[PDB]
């Protein structure tokens, strides 16, 4: 499946490495765009964005984003009043659509205050879901704009997907790339732990069913998630504990993008 998301961040303190306002967009869990109060310019976060988008898209969508920077800083200054809050407080936003398999589409739009969910938009009921009393005042005010709610339902249902498909084809060379893994197995001494390791593959999806003897999967294992190497590729590891005195052999059975591999286990 694929997904397109746009985030927004308003914070009460411009303390360094976290500007007052931040807005980043993500395609299929990959950064594409960026904006913050420091640059005040929407910039690409991928080579296949500045190449397939002419200067007008970047020029006009900052003019909008600066309008959203003031709007978003204002909504944070509103919530801090209703809680009599002061100091530092974070105001977040997540919106986007994902085109799944089977063709079914989804849409979502939710806000967050101090990490916790604040209000969530329901495009199929044209209503907002409030979390506390303050969020209910926001519901009773945002709902009073039938033009607004219909516009968003249009964007989530009809127009966001057009951006997603337009973005997938642009960076099809990077987003649909296939890099096979590098599998090595190492040994660790107990105070008998055999590791199966993989580096430098891309799709972030791999199966490491670690076998035993000839044809018996080993029950007890350990797992580590797909940690990003930072060059665009991902890595993983998985460590069985061999029986102290059994003298049964082991194998790894790494499968990745339809290419299984079998390895020895010292």
């Amino acid at each position: 499946t694929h997904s397109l998301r746009y985030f927004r961040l308003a914070v009460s303190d411009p303390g360094p490495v976290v500007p007052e306002f931040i807005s980043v967009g993500y395609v299929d869990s990959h950064p594409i765009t960026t904006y913050d109060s420091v640059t005040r310019q929407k910039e690409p976060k991928a080579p296949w964005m500045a190449e397939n988008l002419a200067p007008d898209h970047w020029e006009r969508y900052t003019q909008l984003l600066r309008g959203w920077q003031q709007t978003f800083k204002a909504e944070l200054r509103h919530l801090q009043r209703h809680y009599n809050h002061s100091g530092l407080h974070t105001y977040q936003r997540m919106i986007g659509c994902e085109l799944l398999e089977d063709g079914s589409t989804t849409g979502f739009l939710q806000y967050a205050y101090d990490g916790q969910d604040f209000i969530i938009f329901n495009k199929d009921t044209l209503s907002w879901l409030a979390m506390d009393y303050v969020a209910h005042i926001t519901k009773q005010a945002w709902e009073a704009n039938l033009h607004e709610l219909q516009y968003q339902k249009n964007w989530l249902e009809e127009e966001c997907i057009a951006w997603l498909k337009r973005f997938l084809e642009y960076g099809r060379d990077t987003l649909e790339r296939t890099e096979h893994p590098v599998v090595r197995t190492t040994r660790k001494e107990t105070f008998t732990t055999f590791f199966c390791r993989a580096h430098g593959f891309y799709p972030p999806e791999i199966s490491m069913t670690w076998m035993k003897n000839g044809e018996e999967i080993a029950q007890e294992v350990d797992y580590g998630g797909v940690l990003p190497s930072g060059d665009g590729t991902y890595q993983t590891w998985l460590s069985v504990n061999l029986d102290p005195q059994s003298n049964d052999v082991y194998s790894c059975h790494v499968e990745h993008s339809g290419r299984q591999m079998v390895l020895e286990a010292p």
Partner: antibody, heavy 107, light 113 residues
Framework: GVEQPAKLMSVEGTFARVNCTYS??????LSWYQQREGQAPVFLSY??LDGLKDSGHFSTFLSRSNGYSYLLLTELQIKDSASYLC??????????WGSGTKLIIKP | AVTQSPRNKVAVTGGKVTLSCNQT?????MYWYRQDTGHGLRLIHY???????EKGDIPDGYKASRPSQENFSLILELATPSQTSVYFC?????????????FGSGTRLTVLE
């Protein structure tokens, strides 16, 4: 990108339908405005979904696929004598203003 | 609501003309248009906030500034013929895709040799 007729005649009472056809890159909404011969335009209605907005005084139906909308002005009078301007929003949020339809009402 | 000054103007080719606008509506969006016979309203300059002037479809010969939140002024450094039209000033509720523009009374500008 937006094409709109420029003349319309109808009988006092009765009703009229000013039309607006868009060919924008995307679609984020369609707004109707009424300009009374040297006065400033006045907002009339906004449509972005498929259905018609039954406001009693008027109605506005939209067609996403066919790509057009019409404003069903009814119970006409001297006040309903103006030109009508429709504006559609681009995929990058640019207002595309049509020329305008002069709806003259027959006494 | 939204007013324009001057309501009318007659200036010579190559003159300083400043068309200003004022809004009681506490909107942060203000636009400048010119409605001409034939092609409809054409945006010139606007702003999303104080000191946030940007350009539009026809920024040729026009320059704009926004001193305060309730003032957005169109400055014609060198006036010319064919810059003569009806200039409408509009405010905008920051509703994103939905937008109800509130137009002010027109300004008939005429540039004569």
């Amino acid at each position: 990108g937006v094409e709109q007729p420029a003349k319309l005649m109808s009988v006092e009472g009765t009703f009229a339908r000013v039309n607006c056809t868009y060919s924008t890159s995307g679609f984020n909404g369609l707004s109707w405005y009424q300009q009374r011969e040297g006065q400033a335009p006045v907002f009339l209605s906004y449509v972005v979904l498929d259905g018609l907005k039954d406001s009693g005084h008027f109605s506005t139906f939209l067609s996403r696929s066919n790509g057009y909308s019409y404003l069903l002005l009814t119970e006409l009078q001297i006040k309903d004598s103006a030109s009508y301007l429709c504006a559609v929003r681009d995929s990058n949020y640019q207002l595309i203003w049509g020329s305008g339809t002069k709806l003259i009402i027959k006494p | 609501a939204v007013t324009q000054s001057p309501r009318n103007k007659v200036a010579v080719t190559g003159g300083k003309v400043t068309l200003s606008c004022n809004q009681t509506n506490n909107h942060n969006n203000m636009y400048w248009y010119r409605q001409d016979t034939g092609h409809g309203l054409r945006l010139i300059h606007y702003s999303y906030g104080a000191g946030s002037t940007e350009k539009g479809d026809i920024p040729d010969g026009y320059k704009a500034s926004r001193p305060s939140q309730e003032n957005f002024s169109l400055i014609l450094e060198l006036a010319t013929p064919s810059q003569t039209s009806v200039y409408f000033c509009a405010s905008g509720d920051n509703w994103g895709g939905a937008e109800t523009l509130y137009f002010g009374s027109g300004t008939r500008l005429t540039v004569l040799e």
